[PDB]
């Protein structure tokens, strides 16, 4: 038995084949523990993986094109998951989000499963990432009998974290800089969508940075206005995004297929936006693109690096993610580390 | 044949294998005794302990999670007794105490179960601590059958307060500091919810401290209006919490499941209230946190050990209250000691 | 799943909570992965801990009484371990030194435990320090999962060794002083106990000496007998000891409860000795006291570093050991240094 992120206790499968995905991202997790047959043991999954993750899934397809034939369960929201098609599924273990675009502790397709034998298991790597993060892959490895994977993956995941927080921990507030991190930035109807304590929040934290948004909002995710963003004029400026290149839609280019050039040239669109454009953080080049999905993935650890290389970026001059990146995947994945997951300004 | 706290004569069984818990945090005192099989002879318990302790309920829970199917009696108060409930459970022995969230020495539970044949035993660990804690616990080691763990914890127990009053017990009362303790501080409809000639207060005495309420009071429990607080204006602020870290409510954040920065950003909130403010204590950094459910258990060694340091920083430098639970746990427990009990302002 | 001292592959245990110490003092490669928790996971040990290293302990008894209840499998003997009371603690992992006070790779014990299904790890700080030292801890690292205090701790390690090899490395042989090291002087039945090639000839070797018996001597520890010491008259002289100050019989008085003119006075009673004290290295003052465990420590890098600045006093003026030892406490153990464990002669 185990305890699962939501506190309760399941009852671990003696064999696991048939695993469902209550948030297709949840994948990402899932993928350093299935070394070089990732998709093997997947009955089915959230669709947020294959439509809001295009790029990570063309790669996989390109190696593994039966991805394709796994079954979506719904698109993007947990309300358009059909729990008729799940359950003819006959999964042997659900993984589910405390948080996300799937069903979270409290929803019927959770107690449906309960009320059908199957055992659901909770994860977090979005909500409180610094809590959760590492818990959620040990807890993985027991249920899906890769204890071995999970084990290694901590282990590498703490010593590549240590390495920026036995300096960052040590940083008295007032050497801090001020930072926010603007969430899929142009992308939103309203801006700006950002975080508190917690999500992304939790690696400025860890970076040794100062979470602007930290004490505006009460969750792990939010908004502030831009006029409050101009007005508190931090140090430095964030702005995540995952859009494919060729993606006429407003937002920030970073994934699997994304060259540096049109990284670079997409990060600047977002930072000629009007009022953006004025920061002093923007005018000093202390502007960065970060992926967004790094804001529920246990590779998180990618993003702490590039975020201690921007807060301090000599006492960080030696540390290299793009080295953890090829470090990670060569030990973990069944694919190829390819593309631009974080860009500077130009 | 043995007097417990309410000064009546009981058997002791000769084996005892059904133990009904009147209040269900009664349970700390029969975990010192249990060894590494804690809920192995617990027939029920009122709820207060499952409910009122969640942080400890779930880390028992992860190693133990028979402890969900022991039944619950009630919910936190006296009145929510089934009596029938009680009685179907076939208890052997019965401990309830002198006050607290359970049936009291004159309840006509009580009177059933002497009707029907079931020993009670009162102990005592909330109204008269200095009084009781070591009888409760000779007394619970006789009826019980465990007189070995109970003479090893009152050893343990007078030593590591002997630590405290071979120092204060010499120190004349013009030169003992002021304090306030504010139960459940933040967390009551009407403020401020405190301890009298009883309860913390004998906490207070032992650690050489000088009780504000003490003469405000007849009982062990009682309330003090906020002006009067700031009036009288009192060296030392404290305030007692258990307030999980994820639960929105006010109150102090303290337990199994409490970092310390959850605990000083919690005690931190309680501070700035109105009022509390602009206490001397507050404005001097003389303001601290104490897990509310020391008020009923005879772990409130740890509590008073806090309590002598907080008053004589220096006197109790090298007393270590952590290494005091630590060995608590080690000795008598079957977890392992997480979490903050005790919290100083930043 | 590792490969021990021995060359034996050992499997590496899920969990471990029950630690068997074939010699006690191994306990001090342990304390440096238990942070706060030492003795958390001891089932038993050997006793020269407890009676070979009086002062240490008691240092670590009065902050953790329980240490007392620790199982003694046995005196300062491998003979003496009755293999019956071992078993009896069910161990999960048994901690072998190549050679020492208990038993070795080929004793029936390790047999014993291996039938029993028990996994027997070697370690080796004593024998071939330099080989030995760095490999042990790593090795303890992966069986104890303390992966992240190993790998901190053979950092410090070779930081502070390389602050002596840096230097060392470069003298020439001929420019390289003669050293004898006569290990728990004063205190044997016959002169005079000493290190070859292997133990605190290591230490020689490393910090840039020339050790007189490095080719008397086939093994590790052996004799050379007092003349042929006063014929090689070598440059400088060291005696070890671990006396404990109320200790009227011969020997060197070094260790966590001793002070600087106790070890001062004790160590002019092993130089004014017959035939010592015509020593060239004795008249000359070049004569010193180094704390005789270290003849099996991983703390052994502050005896590197004491030997190179007594070998060279001006190149090594900069270099602190004592320093050292504070970095090592504070960053790794859970009680405070004292006493001490180097002396120069008046
Ligand atoms: N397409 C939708 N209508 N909702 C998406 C579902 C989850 C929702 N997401 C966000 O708020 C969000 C914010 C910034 C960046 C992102 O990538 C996001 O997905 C969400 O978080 N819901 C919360 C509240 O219900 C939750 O799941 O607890
Ligand atoms: N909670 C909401 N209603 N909206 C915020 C999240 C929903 C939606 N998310 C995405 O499109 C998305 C894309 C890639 C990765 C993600 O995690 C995503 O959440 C969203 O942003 N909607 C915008 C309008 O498009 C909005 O609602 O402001
Ligand atoms: N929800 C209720 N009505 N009562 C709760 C339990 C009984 C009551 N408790 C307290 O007053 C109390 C006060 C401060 C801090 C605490 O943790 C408390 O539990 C109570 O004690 N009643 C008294 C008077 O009869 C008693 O039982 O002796
Ligand atoms: N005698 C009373 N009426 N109130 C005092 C106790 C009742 C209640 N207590 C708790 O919720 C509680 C929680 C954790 C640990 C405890 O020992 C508790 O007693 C209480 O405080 N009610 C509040 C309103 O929430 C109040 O009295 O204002
Ligand atoms: N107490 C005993 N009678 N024997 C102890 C056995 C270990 C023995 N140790 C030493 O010879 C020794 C020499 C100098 C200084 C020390 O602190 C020592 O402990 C020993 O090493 N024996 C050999 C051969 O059996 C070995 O263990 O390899
Ligand atoms: N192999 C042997 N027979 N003797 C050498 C070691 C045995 C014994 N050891 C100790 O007293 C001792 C004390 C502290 C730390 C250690 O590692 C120790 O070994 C010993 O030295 N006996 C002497 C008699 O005085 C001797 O054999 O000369
Ligand atoms: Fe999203
Ligand atoms: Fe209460």
């Given at each position: 038995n185990i305890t699962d992120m939501a506190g309760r206790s399941v009852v671990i499968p003696?064999?696991?084949?048939r695993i469902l995905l209550g948030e297709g991202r949840l994948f990402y997790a899932v993928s350093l523990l299935e070394?070089?047959?990732?998709?093997?043991?997947?009955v089915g999954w959230q669709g947020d993986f294959r439509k809001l993750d295009t790029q990570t899934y063309a790669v996989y397809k390109a190696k593994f094109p039966q991805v394709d034939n796994i079954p979506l369960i719904g698109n993007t929201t947990a309300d358009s998951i059909s729990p008729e098609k799940v359950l003819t599924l006959n999964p042997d273990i659900a993984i589910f989000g405390l948080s996300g675009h799937g069903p979270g502790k409290n929803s019927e397709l959770v107690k449906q499963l309960e009320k059908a034998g199957v055992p659901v298991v909770f994860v977090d790597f979005r909500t409180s990432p610094l809590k959760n993060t590492l818990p959620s892959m040990r807890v993985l490895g027991k249920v899906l009998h890769r204890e071995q994977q999970a084990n290694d993956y901590i282990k590498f995941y703490e010593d590549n974290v240590r390495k920026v927080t036995e300096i960052?921990?040590?940083?008295?507030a007032d050497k801090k800089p001020s930072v926010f991190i603007e969430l899929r930035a142009g992308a939103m109807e309203e801006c700006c969508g950002t975080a508190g304590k917690g999500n992304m929040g939790d690696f400025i934290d860890q970076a040794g940075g100062n979470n602007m948004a930290k004490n505006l909002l009460p969750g792990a995710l939010g908004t502030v206005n831009l006029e409050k963003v101009l007005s508190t004029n931090p140090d430095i400026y964030i702005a995540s995004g995952g859009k494919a290149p060729d993606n006429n839609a407003p937002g920030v280019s970073l994934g699997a297929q994304v060259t540096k050039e049109q990284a670079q040239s997409s990060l600047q669109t977002i930072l000629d936006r009007k009022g953006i454009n004025t920061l002093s953080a923007v005018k000093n080049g202390r502007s960065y693109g970060i992926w967004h999905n790094f804001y529920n993935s246990p590779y998180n650890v990618l993003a702490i690096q590039s975020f201690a290389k921007w807060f301090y970026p000599q006492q960080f001059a030696d540390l290299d993610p793009n080295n953890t990146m090829n470090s990670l995947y060569s030990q973990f994945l069944a694919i190829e580390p390819t593309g631009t997951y974080w860009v500077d300004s130009t």
């Open positions: 003696a064999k696991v084949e070394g070089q047959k990732p998709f093997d043991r997947i960052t921990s040590k940083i008295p």
